[PDB]
Design a protein around this ligand. Structure first.
Ligand SMILES: Cc1cc(NC(=O)C(=O)N2C[C@@H](C)CC[C@@H]2c2ccccc2)cnc1N
Ligand SMILES: CSC[C@H]1O[C@@H](n2cnc3c(N)ncnc32)[C@H](O)[C@@H]1O
Lengths: 625, 303
């Protein structure tokens, strides 16, 4: 259900308080570790020599309780970016002191505010603490959707609130976060505690926080409307934002006093519970992929490598994908063999990369459904899977199926095929080298034969995710280029990200390829109109494929085959993020490159600024032939 | 559960001394209200006329007439405490949780029937002290409200200042009740406010850099300003004298007393922690009482 904490700025007795919030149903407590009002001097006598204790004792809670239940809060008087030198110097010393005490107690998270534009010294001091022993602790930067100045009552006679469109200005709060996080070099220990006001801004202002590392959402008691019964509740627009945040599995923090006096403090929480329980439950795709959100994996190479048993097992647990192969074979059989030839014409049907045989079985189911005679060859170079095929063939299939343990580019076929059937497609369509494989098998397709699939097309879309940029950055390994992790694709269920433009087609391949001059290399230029302010961290890749006529597979979000989980999208990162302003065009360039031995991708952004060419000559990433 | 950080000191008309205190460190972070009919006996608990414990700290304090005490709580509550008929006990009259963070400042209006509070939630509230409800709530500032100060003779008028670097002059009779006034340009943040007792139209404000400024509301130009302190000016209290003296308090742990042209007449280092409040004896107009975080009650004679 919902993981949620209480925010307090007043704790007379930490034992009594923690006991109250637990009874109320909260999971944790954000509280001060020094008294909020207890300003301390470090430079000038006599206040410097103030007798201790300087705060309450670590002995008042178990180590377990500090480690799990308590989030520290930086004292509000601490202003490292004050215009007064004495207040900068004193706040520097006081920030180190409060942060160091937090680390001493082993607190899971510490809260710091972004409440003005200049937080340069605040960032310098946090960055200095972060590099003082490797610790686990998180820094939650408390920042609002809407700056207080842009939220104030219109009640100052000689300083009115502007009633004019201020598109970039209404986003000023995101730029506070962006500048802070950049100063601190994208540390994985610095996240956002997004604070939500009575009146939500424009959507574009909200959409800014897509792709951002949001660990907490803060809800003040103020923003809760009241209903018939008296219960605290939220506007339908506030409910929309909660539903968005629940999918980022954020922690909810309740801040402020109980304004619904007649009702308990369970109610506020009980509303969020009511909201999380009464959302649209998980569909077959969401339920399946729940564990994989933003998990980077290297792409499988089923040509160069032999896939494991358990990898074929997940490929085969996709009934929608095989229904579609069955229907494509069903319709092809009827178009090639007339009714009055059904007993006489036996079609030669060849599965090219048969694994443990799911296309073989779909081929038999198809022939029995169409009432046509077929002859199956099962071609598979992974000799481990060939074991599975040969036990199936002796146990169930019999002499109808001939298992062939070899590479489809080498196999001297005894006869030509009416239909070749294959499933050699990666997340970017051609990234497992289906083109090269089916090209080498073409010579044993009949002059009028059919490849299922007949056609496939890759798609790209620019994305923003400061979260995935950090996940890629953290894939540095010894004994290779320090920047090699940015010059290779990853297969990932992209979750915390922003799609910045509609996907566009990249590379297309047709089978059979009758062309006298076969070249599988490619150069594509794509222009992506962007209608927001954002940051570019890479390109999401998808594919569509025509199996036969109108029967298709797709993982392109707009045309995604319903209920199909065999493929996740791919991610092409770039080394340095790129600022994109509202109105500007992202221009990306992709090449498919090859020699005798290797196929690879190279890519580059050429607008609104140029990147380096990524993966030149396959130095960081190659796909083996 | 004792409180050694002295926050407030206010002489009543008959010369009795009100103390507010916080615990800002140790096991319990609470507060307490004391009354000393003998002012020389303070701050010693054993020779008090009356005392009570509060749930939470006290950030600011003020008399409400002769028996009433109005409290700015760490809890977010504004509390009104009444005095016993025999003035032995101090009983809670109302405790209302209407601020969302620490209440930092309170001020009684001229009528004595209404008050205004300022908080770290950036809000300012006007209270009816008979009906125990908030009449108005104003989000005029963009940061925490440091100080609110009721006009001495007009119920609809009061000052406020904030870390948003605004000094607001308020008149609740105007449809837009706040007005921005001060020096020409970029001030160091305003920290303390005091209306002139004689001139409706003039006040002083202390800054976080130690400067004290004399301001005319109408002329909206800083008449005078002097570097009085090495640190933040936390309070400003005019004496009851016919031509009044100005007492200024600072985190620099000093008291200064100033004339109408802001020249230095007196200066006390007797405090060895921050100086939090001051009141002039209504009996002996040359007697000035200070309290501070060092738990000292100093009685200065002022030439
Ligand atoms: C049939 C087929 C299917 C695929 N599909 C994929 O690669 C793929 O998207 N995923 C993501 C997830 C669904 C778990 C399996 C697999 C994977 C496992 C471990 C490392 C990377 C990827 C690729 N090629 C072919 N031919
Ligand atoms: C079901 S995933 C794709 C299957 O095709 C097989 N495959 C890939 N390339 C070739 C090839 N050139 N010859 C035969 N089988 C192949 C792989 O071993 C895998 O089992």
């Amino acid at each position: 259900r919902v993981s949620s904490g209480r925010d307090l700025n007043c704790v007379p007795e930490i034992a009594d308080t923690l006991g109250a919030v637990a009874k109320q149903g909260f999971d944790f407590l954000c509280m001060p570790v020094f008294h909020p009002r207890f300003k301390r001097e470090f430079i000038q006598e006599p206040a410097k020599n103030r007798p201790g204790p300087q705060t309450r004792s670590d002995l008042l809670l178990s180590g377990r309780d500090w480690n799990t239940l308590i989030v520290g809060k930086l004292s509000p008087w601490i202003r490292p970016d004050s215009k007064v030198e004495k207040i900068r110097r004193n706040s520097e010393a006081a920030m180190l002191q409060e942060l160091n005490f937090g680390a001493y107690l082993g607190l899971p998270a510490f809260l710091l505010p972004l409440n003005q534009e200049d937080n340069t010294n605040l960032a310098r001091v946090l960055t200095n603490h972060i590099h003082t022993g490797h610790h686990s602790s998180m820094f939650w930067m408390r920042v609002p959707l809407v700056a207080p100045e842009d939220l104030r009552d219109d009640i100052i006679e000689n300083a009115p609130t502007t009633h004019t469109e201020e598109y970039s200005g209404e986003e000023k709060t995101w730029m506070w976060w962006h500048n802070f996080r950049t100063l601190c070099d994208y540390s994985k220990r610095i996240a956002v505690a997004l604070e939500i006001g009575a009146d939500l801004p424009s959507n574009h202002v909200i959409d800014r926080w897509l792709g951002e590392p949001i660990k907490a959402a803060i809800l003040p008691t103020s923003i809760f409307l009241t209903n018939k019964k008296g219960f605290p509740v939220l506007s339908k627009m506030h409910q929309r934002l909660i539903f968005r945040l629940l999918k980022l599995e954020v922690q909810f923090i309740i801040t402020g006093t109980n304004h619904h006096s007649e009702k308990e403090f369970c109610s506020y929480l009980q509303y969020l519970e009511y909201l999380s329980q009464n959302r649209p439950p998980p569909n077959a795709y969401e339920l399946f992929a729940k564990g994989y959100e933003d998990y980077l994996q290297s792409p499988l190479q089923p040509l160069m490598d032999n896939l494991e048993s358990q990898t074929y097992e997940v490929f085969e647990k996709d009934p929608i994908k095989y229904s579609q192969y069955q229907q494509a074979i069903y319709k092809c059989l009827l178009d090639r063999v007339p009714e009055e030839e059904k007993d006489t014409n036996v079609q030669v049907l060849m599965v090219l990369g048969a694994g443990r045989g799911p296309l073989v079985n779909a081929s038999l189911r198809a022939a029995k459904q169409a009432d046509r005679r077929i002859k199956l060859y099962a071609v598979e170079k992974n000799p481990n899977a060939v074991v599975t095929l040969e036990n199936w063939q002796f146990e169930e299939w019999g002499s109808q199926v001939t298992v062939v343990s070899s590479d489809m580019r080498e196999w001297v076929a005894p006869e030509k095929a009416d239909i070749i059937v294959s499933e050699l497609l990666g997340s970017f369509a051609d990234n497992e080298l289906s083109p090269e494989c089916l090209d080498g098998a073409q010579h044993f397709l009949k002059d009028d034969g059919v490849s299922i699939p007949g056609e496939y097309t890759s798609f790209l879309a620019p994305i923003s995710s400061s979260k995935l940029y950090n996940e890629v950055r953290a894939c540095r390994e010894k004994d290779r280029d320090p920047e090699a992790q940015f010059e290779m694709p990853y297969v990932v269920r992209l979750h915390n990200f922003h799609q910045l433009s509609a996907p566009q087609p990249c590379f297309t391949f047709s089978h059979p390829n009758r062309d006298p001059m076969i070249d599988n290399n490619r150069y594509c230029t794509l222009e992506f109109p962007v209608e927001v302010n954002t940051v570019l961290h890479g390109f999401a890749g998808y594919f569509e494929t025509v199996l036969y006529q109108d029967i298709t597979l797709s993982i392109r979000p707009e045309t995604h085959s319903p209920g199909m989980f065999s493929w996740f999208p791919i991610l092409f990162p770039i080394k340095q993020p790129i600022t994109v302003r509202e109105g500007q065009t992202i221009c990306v360039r992709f090449w498919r490159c090859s020699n005798s031995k290797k196929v690879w991708y190279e890519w580059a952004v050429t607008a609104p600024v140029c990147s380096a060419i990524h993966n030149p000559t396959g130095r960081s990433y190659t796909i083996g032939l | 559960c004792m409180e050694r950080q002295l926050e407030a000191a206010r002489y009543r008309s008959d010369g009795a001394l009100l103390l507010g205190a916080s615990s800002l460190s140790g096991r319990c972070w609470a507060g307490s209200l004391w009354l000393f009919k003998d002012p020389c006996a303070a701050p010693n608990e054993g020779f008090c006329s009356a005392g009570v414990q509060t749930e939470a700290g006290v950030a600011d304090l003020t008399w409400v007439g002769e028996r009433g005490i109005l409290v700015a709580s760490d809890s977010g509550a504004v509390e009104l405490w009444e005095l016993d008929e025999n003035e032995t006990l101090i009983v809670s009259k109302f405790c209302k949780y209407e601020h969302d963070d620490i209440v930092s400042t309170v001020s009684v209006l001229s009528s004595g029937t209404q008050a205004v509070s300022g908080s770290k939630d950036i809000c300012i509230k006007v209270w009816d002290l008979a009906q125990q409800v908030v009449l108005s709530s104003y989000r005029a500032h963009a940061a925490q409200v440091t100080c609110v100060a009721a006009s001495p003779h007009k119920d609809s008028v009061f000052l406020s200042c904030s870390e948003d670097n605004r000094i607001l002059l308020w008149d609740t009779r105007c449809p837009k009740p706040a007005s921005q006034i001060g020096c020409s340009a970029p001030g160091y943040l305003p920290t303390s406010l005091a209306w002139h007792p004689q001139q409706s139209e003039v006040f002083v404000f202390g800054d976080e850099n130690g400067t004290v400024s004399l301001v005319d509301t109408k002329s909206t130009s800083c008449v005078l300003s002097s570097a009085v302190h090495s640190q933040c000016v936390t309070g400003l209290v005019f004496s009851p004298h016919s031509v009044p003296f100005l007492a200024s308090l600072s985190e620099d742990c000093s008291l200064a007393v100033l004339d109408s042209s802001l020249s230095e007449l007196f200066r006390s280092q007797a405090h060895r922690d921050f100086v939090r409040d001051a009141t002039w004896s209504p009996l002996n107009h040359s007697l000035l009482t200070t309290v501070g975080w060092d738990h000292q009650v100093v009685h200065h004679v002022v030439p």
